Design a protein around this ligand. Structure first.
Ligand SMILES: [Mg+2]
Ligand SMILES: [Mg+2]
Ligand SMILES: [Mg+2]
Ligand SMILES: [Mg+2]
Ligand SMILES: [Mg+2]
Ligand SMILES: [Mg+2]
Ligand SMILES: [Mg+2]
Ligand SMILES: [Mg+2]
Ligand SMILES: [Mg+2]
Ligand SMILES: [Mg+2]
Ligand SMILES: [Mg+2]
Ligand SMILES: [Mg+2]
Ligand SMILES: [Mg+2]
Ligand SMILES: [Mg+2]
Ligand SMILES: [Mg+2]
Ligand SMILES: [Mg+2]
Ligand SMILES: [Mg+2]
Ligand SMILES: [Mg+2]
Ligand SMILES: [Mg+2]
Ligand SMILES: [Mg+2]
Ligand SMILES: [Mg+2]
Ligand SMILES: [Mg+2]
Ligand SMILES: [Mg+2]
Ligand SMILES: [Mg+2]
Ligand SMILES: [Mg+2]
Ligand SMILES: [Mg+2]
Ligand SMILES: [Mg+2]
Ligand SMILES: [Mg+2]
Ligand SMILES: [Mg+2]
Ligand SMILES: [Mg+2]
Ligand SMILES: [Mg+2]
Ligand SMILES: [Mg+2]
Ligand SMILES: [Zn+2]
Lengths: 275, 88, 115, 96, 65, 32
RNA sequence: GGGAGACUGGAAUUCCUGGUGUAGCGGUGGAAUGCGCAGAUAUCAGGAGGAACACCGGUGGCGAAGGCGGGUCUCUGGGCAGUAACUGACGCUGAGGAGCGAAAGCGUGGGGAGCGAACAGGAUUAGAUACCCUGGUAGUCCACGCCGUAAACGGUGGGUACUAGGUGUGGGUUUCCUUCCUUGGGAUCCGUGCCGUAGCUAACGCAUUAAGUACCCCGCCUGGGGAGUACGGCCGCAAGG
RNA sequence: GCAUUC
């Protein structure tokens, strides 16, 4: 759920925080943690290539299993649900009967002690991962591969899910969280369920400093820059920019998907805008 | 609703004699069971207002029976409260 | 093209009449409407206008060789019987008359009452 | 333990000789759960009054079980996940 | 007016299985016949109506033939 | 009784609601 | 069809994809805006999605009232009859108070097919901020809160006893006539209608489901307007109560 | 279809 802060200070008025109710353990698996460091939005040239990044809390990477392909038939039990800094969803530590320990995105409703299984023979129960071929149409799924063996790429953020609409030949038709309908190979893997932590979107961060903790630097509006800095810059007093809205690099607001991408053959229709 | 089995068990414990089903002690004990079970139901079904009205009627009845017991024999009243775990 | 036996779909509403002749597979071979026979406005809802529309579609169907027709009528208009009669008189055989006005099992809210 | 009558409509593309074994395994859920599986009447291929999942016909089975509510709901869920099952229908067969 | 055949001592049980029994109480349009026409009592008419609806869902009877 | 009686009340109520509409912002600013 | 949760069924509207096929379709009292000719309407097949549940279905059932109708399952409230096994006046009503409370509206998050305040055009007209037409946004739907009003009406507070009958219908009991056919008929208990005595009423009407004959408790009225308004206060996010 | 007022 969401816990609302009391208005004891201007910075806290209106703000809220996760109740972290699903969290069972406060520390990660040592053997599944890798180091991570901040990039500040700078690339190999040391140039800022993504603005508004830097200054966030230090965090470590939990190795998430996005393939789940080498454990068909080996059941696992959910040992813990824990917080991950690197994504909106929570993560579930699985103990396989192999004695292997792996992290997976925690689906909605998955509790400690549940049994999870993988592969063609698995039951259609939240957290079970199996080829789309064996997933009946109409089911809600997440963490879907784009290419067989490529690893889960779609529907990974907290609360999101994909609906498997149907199967025809080698392809399954999927409705994306965005609403776009697209085809994927039926050999591609998916996990049954929605993604957990769906309440996170309702959090009111409350104050500038908390976004700084999350690594977001301030965004200066174009209209308050000078012409040399931004096409919207300039003018005496307040202005609307003095021209059609453009990026800081002058690109107009239009479609930016490249024409004639090969994936255009797999896309049935694009998302609808302003429905 | 209470089954014949659950009713027999409750009456065997709180009836003042065998075959007793009508004494306030027996009735309050039956009411207390019903109420507990209905409270369990209303924890799951928050919006079942019609069944919760039934609950309030059972509560009112129990109160009146308890008021009768206290009017007749305070000793039986205190025994009944403590034996059932009621507050008042 | 040629087809010996077909179906006639007649949709008669309070404003118009639309007859279409079709193969049993549902592909339309000919059609006519009260506006296609030159009636405009309210005149195109009269039974006489349904007569002419049914006749015109029947003639166009004879061209493609239709001999016998089963008629499916819907709608609440006044050019249903007239249309059946005009199909027969224009030289088509009418086997079955079946009425298939779409009826909801309590579905979408009707538009509000006129006053 | 309450009596329940389960109607199942199976794929007509199946063979009837293999229908009976496949239902029996599906019904083990009840026997492991402590309930009974009395009668598994298998009607033959009949014409459906309307097409279901593009099928004009299907195989009707009637299964009478005494079991706990939880176990019969588990059975139905598995049945509806099976590809060969088209439509199920569970009816409690006792007063109220 | 006419009596309710299910109140008689011979009255057949009403089950959604029995397509041939239920056929008595639906029109050729497939519609459930009014009790005022059939003579059924209130209780048995309810049974018939429910049995017919269950029969339609298990595709033993049509939705409006 | 006669609808006349209802009509008298109707008018008074309607005019009051319309007055409350027109003064809504004024009542807030003067009530602060 | 008393309530709550979960799953699920078909018809129809709309859209989408693809056939067939053209030049009209749509709408009215009569028209025009509108949709088409860039391939509509119509017809056939497949897909998506939301909402409401035809027939059954009634001046019929259930609920304190508001209200409640596709099916299934799970959990759950009340009522009625029979038997008198049990308790032994434990009853009735209830100032304040608490809870429930149509629709509209409000907050946050979903959903949005159809319908549709506002809003556009078209028409009508002296004008037409309308009625009619074409569109169309909030909303209508879901989750969790808030709001607390309705001709929330039987314009009839609750409990109890008594006071001609006749006749429908819903739920139980029972005696006779007997085929034992059974809407055969009687008695009895509990609902729900119509018609009618006595009695009551200004009249209309009510009339064993009273507005009759009486007893107990509560609420409310005291000429019409001003006004269910102002002021104060309480409640509400606001509307406002 | 339309038909305001005294
Ligand atoms: Mg470097
Ligand atoms: Mg930025
Ligand atoms: Mg996180
Ligand atoms: Mg945010
Ligand atoms: Mg800024
Ligand atoms: Mg400057
Ligand atoms: Mg420049
Ligand atoms: Mg200036
Ligand atoms: Mg967006
Ligand atoms: Mg019944
Ligand atoms: Mg609900
Ligand atoms: Mg087309
Ligand atoms: Mg079409
Ligand atoms: Mg009281
Ligand atoms: Mg009071
Ligand atoms: Mg509402
Ligand atoms: Mg508003
Ligand atoms: Mg809202
Ligand atoms: Mg909203
Ligand atoms: Mg309109
Ligand atoms: Mg409330
Ligand atoms: Mg009032
Ligand atoms: Mg009402
Ligand atoms: Mg009143
Ligand atoms: Mg009275
Ligand atoms: Mg009576
Ligand atoms: Mg009378
Ligand atoms: Mg009077
Ligand atoms: Mg006044
Ligand atoms: Mg006031
Ligand atoms: Mg004031
Ligand atoms: Mg004048
Ligand atoms: Zn009967």
């Amino acid at each position: 759920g969401i816990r609302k802060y009391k208005p004891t200070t201007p910075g806290r008025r209106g703000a809220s925080v996760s109740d972290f109710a699903e969290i069972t353990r406060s520390t990660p698996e040592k053997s599944l943690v890798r180091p991570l460091h901040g990039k500040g939005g700078r690339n190999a040239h040391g140039r800022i290539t993504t603005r508004h990044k830097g200054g966030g809390h230090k965090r470590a990477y939990r190795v998430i299993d996005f393939r789940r392909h080498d454990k068909d038939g080996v059941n696992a039990k959910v040992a813990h649900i824990e917080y991950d800094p690197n994504r909106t969803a929570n993560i579930a530590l699985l103990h396989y009967l192999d004695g292997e320990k792996r992290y997976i995105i925690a689906p909605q409703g998955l509790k400690q002690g549940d049994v999870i299984e993988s592969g063609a023979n698995a039951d259609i129960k939240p957290g079970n991962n199996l080829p789309l071929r064996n997933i009946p149409a109409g089911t809600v799924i997440h963490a879907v591969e784009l290419r067989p063996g490529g690893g889960a790429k779609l529907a990974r953020s907290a609360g999101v899910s994909i609906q498997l609409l149907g199967k025809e030949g080698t392809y399954a038709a999927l409705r994306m969280p965005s609403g776009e309908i697209r085809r994927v190979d039926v050999r591609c893997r998916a996990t049954v369920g929605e993604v957990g932590n769906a309440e996170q979107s309702n959090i009111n961060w409350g104050k500038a400093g908390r976004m700084r903790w999350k690594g977001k630097r301030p965004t200066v509006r174009g209209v308050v820059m000078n012409p040399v800095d931004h096409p919207h810059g300039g003018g005496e007093g307040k202005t609307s920019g003095g021209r059609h809205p453009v990026s800081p690099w002058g690109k107009p607001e239009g479609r930016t998907r490249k024409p004639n991408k090969p994936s255009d053959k797999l896309i049935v229709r694009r998302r609808r805008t302003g429905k | 609703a209470l089954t014949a089995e659950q009713k027999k068990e409750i009456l065997g414990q709180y009836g003042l004699h065998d075959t007793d089903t009508g004494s306030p002690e027996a009735q309050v004990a039956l009411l207390t069971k019903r109420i507990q079970d209905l409270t369990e139901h209303l924890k799951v079904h928050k919006h079942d207002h019609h069944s919760r009205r039934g609950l309030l009627l059972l509560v009112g009845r129990r109160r009146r029976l308890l008021k009768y017991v206290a009017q007749v024999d305070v000793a039986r009243y205190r025994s009944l409260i403590e034996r059932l775990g009621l507050r008042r | 093209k040629n087809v010996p036996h077909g179906a006639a779909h007649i949709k008669s509403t309070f404003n118009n009449t639309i007859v279409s002749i079709t193969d049993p597979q549902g592909n339309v071979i000919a059609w006519a409407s009260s506006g296609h026979v030159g009636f405009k406005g309210s005149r195109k809802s009269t039974p006489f206008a349904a007569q002419l529309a049914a006749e015109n579609a029947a003639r166009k169907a004879q061209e493609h060789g239709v001999k016998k027709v089963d008629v499916f009528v819907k709608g609440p208009g006044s050019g249903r019987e007239t249309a059946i009669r005009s199909l027969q008189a224009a030289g088509l055989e009418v086997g079955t008359i079946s009425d298939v006005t779409p009826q909801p099992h309590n579905g979408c809210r009707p538009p509000k009452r006129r006053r | 333990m309450r009596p329940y009558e389960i109607m199942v409509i199976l794929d007509p593309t199946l063979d009837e000789r293999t229908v009976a074994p496949s239902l029996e395994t599906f019904l083990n859920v009840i026997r492991k759960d402590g309930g009974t599986v009395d009668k598994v009447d298998i009607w033959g291929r009949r014409r459906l009054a309307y097409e279901i999942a593009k099928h004009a016909e299907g195989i009707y089975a009637v299964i009478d079980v005494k079991a706990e509510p939880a176990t019969v709901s588990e059975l139905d869920r598995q049945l509806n996940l099976n590809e060969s099952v088209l439509r199920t229908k569970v009816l409690r067969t006792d007063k109220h | 007016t006419r009596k309710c055949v299910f109140c008689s001592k011979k009255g057949q049980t009403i089950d959604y299985k029995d397509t041939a029994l239920l056929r008595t109480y639906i029109s050729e349009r497939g519609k459930i016949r009014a009790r005022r026409v059939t003579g059924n009592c209130v209780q048995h008419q309810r049974d018939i109506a429910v049995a017919v609806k269950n029969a339609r869902e298990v595709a033993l009877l049509p939705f409006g033939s | 009784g006669s609808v006349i009686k209802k009509r008298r009340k109707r008018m008074s109520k309607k005019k009051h609601r319309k007055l409350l509409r027109r003064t809504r912002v004024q009542r807030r600013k003067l009530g602060k």
